Structures are given as C-alpha cells and as structure tokens.
C-alpha cells in the first residue's frame, strides 16, 4: 500500500490535469477535473500521510491539483467556496473561501519560510493560514524546530494579524508512511494550541475536545500521533483528576483474508496496547475515571450486529492493565454504510466497567434532534443516553465540590 497508494496518487493527480490527446499540447494552466479527485477527497483510506509529498513536487500544475485535495478534504464538512491559485515570491500560493478565507503554502525547508510568509500574506480574527514544509534537514530535536517557529512567528506577528489570522498551522510531510506533524498557533498573540497538535485543525473535531468542557485540560505529548493524551482536572474540584485519551484510526490497508469484523477488532486492539503503554509510563497519580475514545474514520460495510460483536471481550482482555490504570469506560465511533442506501451511518459503542461486576456495551447511532442537535439514539433498548446530545460534556464528581 504505502508504495501503491503513493504511486496511485501520482497518476490520479495527473489524470485531473490532462485535458488533451496524444501529441497536441495542453493548456499551461487549466482547472483540474473534480470528478477524478472526488475519489481521493472522499476516500475511506488515509491520504494526508503522503499527499503532502505531492505539494512541493516539480510540476507546479501538479502542486495545485494536490493542494485542492488537501483543502477539499480538510474542509469537507464545511461549505467551501472557490479556489484561486496565485504566484508568490518563490512558490505558488493557494487561496480559498469557506463557511472566511484560507491560505495554503508549499515550502522545501523551514529556512525558506520567513521569506514566502510575509509575501503570501499580501494576498488578503477570522482567517486561516497553513504551511507545508517538505523537509527539515538541518535540525534534530523537535523543541529546536519549534523555537525557530516561535521566532518565525514573532517576526511576522504584525503582518499575521493584518490578515486576520485566527490560526496558523505548520505541517510536515513524510513518505515512509508516518502521519504528518502539525503545529497550529492561535490568536493575536501567536501561540501553540498544544491541544491540537498533529491534526489539521479543520478535522480537529475528530478529537471531540468539547466534551471535556468541565475539566481543565493539558496534553501529554507522545511518540505516537494517532494517540492524544490529556490530563484533565475538574474545574469545580481539584481532586477529580482523570486521563482522557483520544485515539484515531484511519485505515491504510485492509487485508483480503480477514473480515471487516476481524479488522476493526485488531486495529482496535493495536491502539489499546499503545494507548495503555503510554499510560503505564506517564504519571497517573490520583487518577480515577480514565477514558478511552477510539474514533475510526473509514466507512465500513460491516453490520451493527457484527460491529457490536467485534467488541465483545475487548476490555475483558486487558483486565489488569485497565484496572491498575483505573480506566473505567471506553467509547468507539464507527461508520457503517447503509446496505441499501449506501449512505454513511455512524454508530457509537460505549463500554462501561462501572457497576464493577460486569461490563456493558451500550450501542447507539447518531441522529438529529427535533432542535437541530445530534443525539445518541440507542440501537437496542434505551440505554444510559438515549436522547442525550452527542456533544454532552463529561460530568464532574459533584460530591467533591466545597
């Protein structure tokens, strides 16, 4: 796959750019066919892991077709406008509108940023800036690479504001399969939003950090960038300390042999082990109600009954590890494709150790309320949160309030 996908993109981007037959030359710069890219933008598989490669490629016409992907996909749950491709100081600059405007830039090395930055800003808090770096051959530590960003930011600060930059994101490509890195900095003082590291901000909703609105969060950086760990402390009670962990699975390659059930289940396990590793290391001192949240991103042909079955025994299998770490509940978010309609239908497994004697895997779908809001709707018999809103924050231990 890594290779075959990477190969698949080269062709796929170029088929959008080709308008003509053999021999006859094509326009130097035309639009790219959406319909060809519509596979890549709406794909169930991962894309942002390699796609970044094809942004600082040779042909500038390609770069453009690759960026649309990045933006079209990145802002797919947004009503996107029209995209305009400029030429900047060195590299081209892509600009789009959505509902506010966004800038996208392509670079070769972090030393060349300060340059194009200021320039690009001449294209013009409510707007979005984000930058891809092709490489950082020159630095070593991460903290090293940051402090240059902190400069590169603090240096253009004024210009950044004058373009109403809500937030600016620095991306870092790869080719070996690693998911890119991301550093996003907010606001009128430009500063790392540490809580959304290593995710495009448009997709950040994936972590569902809103649901931690009753606690004071702090990330706890990790080798692994599918896993986001947060130390959380009740706003109303400093003794109610917890550890919310927010894993995301996005599928690179499904095998032929194995069913969807087996896939979900193994991929599922594979996180857990890492997840639980990172905890069996970090200082989880007076923790007590720790939480795991696996968010599958692909869409799947499995059926609800199959899904549920996929997670029978899931936790039981890590009994000790979960018990010493004091994890109590899990929550998994899977997306089925309706058998007839083919429409994607999201599910929600919720598994609860609570009432310590047995585990309980409540199941649910997501559905819009009468009022507008999305709502857990139990698949089976009414369960804990049958009409409750999906976006409902985690409640605090009230009996620790002074």
Pull the structure tokens for residue 226: 């599918």
Method for this entry: X-ray
Task: Report which secondary-structure segment, H or E, holds 242.
Answer: strand 237-249
Q: How far, in Å, CA of 247 to CA of 272, rounded?
A: 9
Pairing mode of beta strands 80-87, 92-98:
antiparallel
Residue 71 in contact with residue 99, Cβ under 8 Å?
no
List residues bridging with 363 in a β-sheet.
349
Half-sphere exposure of 371 (CA within 13 A, CB side): 6
Q: How far, in Å, CA of 43 to CA of 349, rounded?
A: 23
Helix (H, G, I), strand (E, B) or coil at 345: strand
Q: How far, in Å, CA of 194 to CA of 185, rounded?
A: 8
Pairing mode of beta strands 237-249, 290-296:
parallel
* Residue from 180, 202, 201, 184 nearest 193 by CA: 184
CA distances from 169 to 24, 133, 227 (A): 41, 11, 19
Q: How far, in Å, CA of 52 to CA of 398, rounded?
A: 46
The residue behind tokens 């990172």 is 278
Pull the structure tokens for residue 385: 């949160």
Phi, psi of 397 (to 5 degrees): -75, 105
Alpha-helix residue ranges (DSSP H) falling in 290-361: 304-310, 319-324
Burial class (CB in 10 A: 0-12, 13-18, 19+), 20: exposed
Burial class (CB in 10 A: 0-12, 13-18, 19+), 99: exposed
Other C-beta atoms closer than 10 Å to the C-beta of 239 total 11
Q: How far, in Å, CA of 32 to CA of 59, rounded?
A: 14
Other C-beta atoms closer than 10 Å to the C-beta of 262 total 12
CB under 8 Å to 67, separation ≥6 — which residues? 55, 85, 94, 104, 106
Backbone Cα Rg of the chain = 23
Q: How far, in Å, CA of 387 to CA of 57, rounded?
A: 49
The domain segmentation of the chain, as residue ranges, is 1-74, 75-206, 207-402
Residue 336 in contact with residue 342, Cβ under 8 Å?
no
Alpha-helix residue ranges (DSSP H) falling in 182-259: none
């Amino acid at each position: 796959s890594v290779k075959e996908r990477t190969e698949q993109i080269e062709h796929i981007l170029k088929s959008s750019v080709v308008k003509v037959a053999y021999g006859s030359s094509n326009p130097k710069r035309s639009e790219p066919d959406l319909n060809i890219l519509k596979d890549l933008i709406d794909s169930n598989y991962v894309v942002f892991d390699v796609l970044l490669q094809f942004l600082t490629h040779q042909d500038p016409v390609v770069t453009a077709a690759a960026a649309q992907v990045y933006i079209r996909r990145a802002y797919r749950a947004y009503t996107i406008g029209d995209i305009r491709v400029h030429e900047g100081v060195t590299v081209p600059i892509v600009e789009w509108k959505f509902q506010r405007e966004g800038i996208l830039m392509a670079v070769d090395h972090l030393d060349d940023v300060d340059e194009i930055l200021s320039q690009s800003l001449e294209v013009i808090l409510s707007n979005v800036a984000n930058v891809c770096v092709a490489s950082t051959e020159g630095f070593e530590s991460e903290e090293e690479i940051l402090v240059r960003l902190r400069e590169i930011l603090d240096l253009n600060k004024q210009e950044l504001i004058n373009a109403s930059i809500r937030r600016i994101t620095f991306m870092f490509g790869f080719k070996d399969g690693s998911y890119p890195k991301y550093y996003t900095f907010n606001g009128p003082n430009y500063n790392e939003n540490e809580t959304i590291r290593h995710i495009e901000p448009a997709l950040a909703f994936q972590l569902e950090l809103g649901r931690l609105s009753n606690f004071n969060i702090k990330p706890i950086f990790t080798d692994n960038r599918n896993i986001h760990v947060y130390e959380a402390v009740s706003k109303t009670s400093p003794l109610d300390k917890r550890f919310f962990t927010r894993g995301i699975i996005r599928t690179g390659h499904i095998r032929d042999d194995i069913s969807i059930q087996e896939y979900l289940t193994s991929e599922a396990n594979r996180l857990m082990s890492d997840i639980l590793d990172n905890l069996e290391v970090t200082d989880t001192s007076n923790s007590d109600l720790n939480h795991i949240f696996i968010n599958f991103i692909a869409v799947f042909d499995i059926s609800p009954e199959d899904v549920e079955a996929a997670f029978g025994g899931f936790l039981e299998r890590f009994g000790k590890r979960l018990l010493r770490l004091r994890v109590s509940s899990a929550e998994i978010r899977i997306i089925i494709k309706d058998p007839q309609t083919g429409a994607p239908v999201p599910l929600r497994a919720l598994i609860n150790n609570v009432s310590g004697y047995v585990i309980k895997t409540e199941m649910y779908t997501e559905v819009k309320n009468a009022k507008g809001e999305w709502v857990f709707k139990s698949l089976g018999k009414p369960g804990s949160m049958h009409l409750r809103p999906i976006a409902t924050p985690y409640p605090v231990k009230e009996w620790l309030q002074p």
